[PDB]
Amino acid sequence: IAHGDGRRPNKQRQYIVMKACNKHHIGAEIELAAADIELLFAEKETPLD
Amino acid sequence: FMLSGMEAAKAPQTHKVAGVWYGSGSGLADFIPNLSELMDTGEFHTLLTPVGPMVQSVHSTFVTKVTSAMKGVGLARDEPRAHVGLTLPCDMLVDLDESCPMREPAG
């Protein structure tokens, strides 16, 4: 404000604010049973196979 | 349990079966005639060597073949990609981890 009172006038001002990021982490869990895992690569014989 | 001669109420679950696994204990104590004095010198624990779990029984009327396992996870015999786990009598296990839930971290 420019104003004529008994008070001395004030100042132009300026503000600078510091902001930054926040890290986060997410899991997930898979089990694959070792009786299952290999027989993707099995011996490949029977019509039951 | 039978070679010891330990008491009934100390382990009353298998004592019913430990007389139908085998006889009255004379079918086992004939091989070791020192069990009344192996206790005296206190050297029975110096003679055992643990082995672990079984894997395969091959049996006959006289001589039974036993293929045991050490060092780790014994691969099974009936199915491929199968593993033999250790089994137990529940009579003989005594846990230590349990209490009232009331904490100590796991590992």
Side-chain angles (χ1 to χ4, degrees):
Chain A
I1 302 175
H3 63 282
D5 290 335
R7 178 178 291 169
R8 300 291 179 90
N10 288 319
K11 300 287 285 187
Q12 60 183 359
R13 289 181 185 172
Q14 184 63 255
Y15 291 100
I16 292 168
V17 178
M18 184 67 200
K19 295 290 179 67
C21 295
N22 288 318
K23 301 294 285 184
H24 294 289
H25 299 284
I26 300 174
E29 286 178 351
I30 297 174
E31 290 180 354
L32 294 173
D36 195 4
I37 294 173
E38 192 272 331
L39 61 89
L40 182 62
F41 293 159
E43 292 295 328
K44 189 61 71 69
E45 55 91 26
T46 184
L48 190 147
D49 195 2
Chain B
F1 182 78
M2 292 300 292
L3 274 77
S4 65
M6 74 180 82
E7 291 294 320
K10 299 293 186 292
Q13 183 65 44
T14 60
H15 187 200
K16 183 178 180 179
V17 188
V20 77
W21 291 103
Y22 295 101
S24 67
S26 66
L28 297 170
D30 288 335
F31 287 169
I32 298 101
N34 292 316
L35 292 178
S36 66
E37 292 180 355
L38 290 176
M39 294 299 296
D40 291 329
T41 63
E43 293 180 354
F44 184 77
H45 65 279
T46 60
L47 296 175
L48 296 175
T49 59
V51 176
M54 289 179 66
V55 178
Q56 183 177 2
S57 291
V58 177
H59 183 75
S60 294
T61 305
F62 293 98
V63 170
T64 304
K65 178 71 171 64
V66 173
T67 300
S68 66
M70 294 177 181
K71 289 182 184 185
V73 179
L75 181 64
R77 292 292 187 267
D78 291 331
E79 293 179 353
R81 296 292 178 270
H83 296 285
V84 176
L86 187 143
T87 62
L88 289 174
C90 294
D91 196 354
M92 295 296 174
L93 188 149
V94 173
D95 194 359
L96 280 76
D97 291 335
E98 59 91 20
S99 292
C100 296
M102 294 177 72
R103 184 178 178 178
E104 292 178 352

